[PDB]
Amino acid sequence: MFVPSYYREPHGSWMAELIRGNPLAMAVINGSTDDGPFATHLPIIPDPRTTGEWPDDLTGANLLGHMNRANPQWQELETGKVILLAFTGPHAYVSPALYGVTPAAPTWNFTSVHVRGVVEKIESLEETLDVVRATAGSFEARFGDDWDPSDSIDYFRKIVPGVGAFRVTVTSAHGMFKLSQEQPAEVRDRVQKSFSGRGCSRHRETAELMGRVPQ
Amino acid sequence: MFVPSYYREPHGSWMAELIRGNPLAMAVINGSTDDGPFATHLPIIPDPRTTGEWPDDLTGANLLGHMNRANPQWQELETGKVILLAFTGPHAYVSPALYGVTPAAPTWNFTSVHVRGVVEKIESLEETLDVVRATAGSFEARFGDDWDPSDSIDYFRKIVPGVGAFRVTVTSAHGMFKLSQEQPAEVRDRVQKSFSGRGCSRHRETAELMGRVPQT
Ligand code: HEM
Numbered sequence: 001m002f003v004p005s006y007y008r009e010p011h012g013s014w015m016a017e018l019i020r021g022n023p024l025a026m027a028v029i030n031g032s033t034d035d036g037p038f039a040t041h042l043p044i045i046p047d048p049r050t051t052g053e054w055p056d057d058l059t060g061a062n063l064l065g066h067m068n069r070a071n072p073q074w075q076e077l078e079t080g081k082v083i084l085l086a087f088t089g090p091h092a093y094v095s096p097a098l099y100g101v102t103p104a105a106p107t108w109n110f111t112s113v114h115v116r117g118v119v120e121k122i123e124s125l126e127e128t129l130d131v132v133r134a135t136a137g138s139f140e141a142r143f144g145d146d147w148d149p150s151d152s153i154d155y156f157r158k159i160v161p162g163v164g165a166f167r168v169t170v171t172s173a174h175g176m177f178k179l180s181q182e183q184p185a186e187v188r189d190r191v192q193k194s195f196s197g198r199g200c201s202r203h204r205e206t207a208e209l210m211g212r213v214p215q
Numbered sequence: 216m217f218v219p220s221y222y223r224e225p226h227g228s229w230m231a232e233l234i235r236g237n238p239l240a241m242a243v244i245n246g247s248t249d250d251g252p253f254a255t256h257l258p259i260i261p262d263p264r265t266t267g268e269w270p271d272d273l274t275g276a277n278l279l280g281h282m283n284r285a286n287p288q289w290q291e292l293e294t295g296k297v298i299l300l301a302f303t304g305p306h307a308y309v310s311p312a313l314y315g316v317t318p319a320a321p322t323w324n325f326t327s328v329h330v331r332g333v334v335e336k337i338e339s340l341e342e343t344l345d346v347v348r349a350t351a352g353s354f355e356a357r358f359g360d361d362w363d364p365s366d367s368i369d370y371f372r373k374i375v376p377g378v379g380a381f382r383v384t385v386t387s388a389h390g391m392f393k394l395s396q397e398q399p400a401e402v403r404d405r406v407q408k409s410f411s412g413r414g415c416s417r418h419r420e421t422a423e424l425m426g427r428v429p430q431t
Pocket residue numbers: 040041042043066067068069071132133135136137139140155156157159160161162163217320321322323
């Protein structure tokens with residue numbers, strides 16, 4: 001990932017935090033020169049077996065995901081192939097009218113974590129079922145409303161052969177936290193103040209991140 | 216892009232709508248087998264010609280973007296290389312507690328447009344300036360607050376040598392509007408109603424889209 005030094009996450013924990021809150025990654029692998037790369041939006045969790053919860057240095061962590069086995073990307077996934085998992089969080093257009101300085105150019109403040117690693121296809125039906133059950137239970141606790149999957153386990157069994165589950169062993173993780181760090185602190189405060197005052201929670205979320213970087 | 220039939224864009228204009236609302240794309244090209252694909256988040260606008268010759272499904276449309284020339288992806292951009300531009304819109308986790316049906320499985324409702332096309336690297340200084348000027352002007356008009364760039368054009372000319380601008384000639388565009396179309400109407404309504412009462416704009420936005428998809 002290409003990241004200007006002043007936009008890197010100040011601490012590794014920022015990356016795990018963004019992934020945890022936005023775990024529907026874009027999973028990308030190389031394709032042919034004619035077709036271009038493959039890309040699928042799919043849910044990622046850390047391996048409950050080993051990594052368990054989200055660490056602050058992601059190197060060597062084991063992640064898990066799943067896709068549709070009919071997805072052509074599944075057939076191109078091979079054990080040993082490299083994969084990119086791109087996670088995105090809050091973002092907002094920055095109008096130079098907020099700056100109070102001239103001259104200027106507009107920009108877009110945004111957040112992204114690019115995780116790269118090596119794929120291992122999961123072939124066991126039960127191991128595959130464990131992955132999706134771990135994804136379900138994890139997300140429901142974090143984002144849901146106390147839903148009990150007990151009465152659905154037979155349903156999970158029935159549809160699970162269509163699940164293409166896989167493991168990713170992380171080789172690198174990079175965060176892009178473009179949050180106006182290139183601007184003077186007074187300028188950053190005006191942008192942050194403008195964002196925190198809008199009824200859009202995405203703008204609010206961007207302002208919160210902006211106020212977290214050191215002065 | 217792999218899209219189950221019931222999640223395809225309800226109408227081609229939905230792809231234009233999502234791109235225009237969320238124009239910071241992830242621009243992706245193949246890389247080495249050791250490195251994996253290149254990916255850069257960058258702003259995309261339609262070529263000004265395209266609005267006056269609009270193709271139904273975006274096929275043949277021309278799009279414009281730019282990145283840092285110091286970005287290693289710029290050296291891999293070659294005229295004629297295929298590229299993927301991924302745009303994402305509103306999304307929200309769907310808990311089966313909203314369904315009121317058993318059995319069920321959780322899912323994530325989300326929106327995405329994947330645009331594939333052929334790159335043309337722009338090298339001319341004036342054409343590069345035209346790209347960033349039109350991006351700034353478009354985005355400011357759509358998202359900004361009446362900022363006038365006239366006092367900053369000299370500034371644009373100073374820094375435009377670092378811009379790597381490019382054109383993409385679209386070869387296909389596909390939408391993924393995963394908005395509970397697989398559920399019965401009574402189920403979709405419960406999710407919409409719960410999402411619209413969240414007060415988070417991302418959830419309310421997802422609910423509004425959900426309600427605008429006709430029954431499949
Ligand atoms: C916890 C949240 C879950 C989310 C967010 C989720 C999300 C997704 C997504 C985005 C896809 C599309 C992949 C592609 O485009 O190739 C997919 C496919 C699939 N997932 Fe999950 N999944 C979850 C849990 C589960 C569970 C518990 C099962 C139980 C077996 C399951 C079974 C499947 C199956 C069978 C497919 C392929 C066919 C279909 O989409 O119905 N998923 N899932």
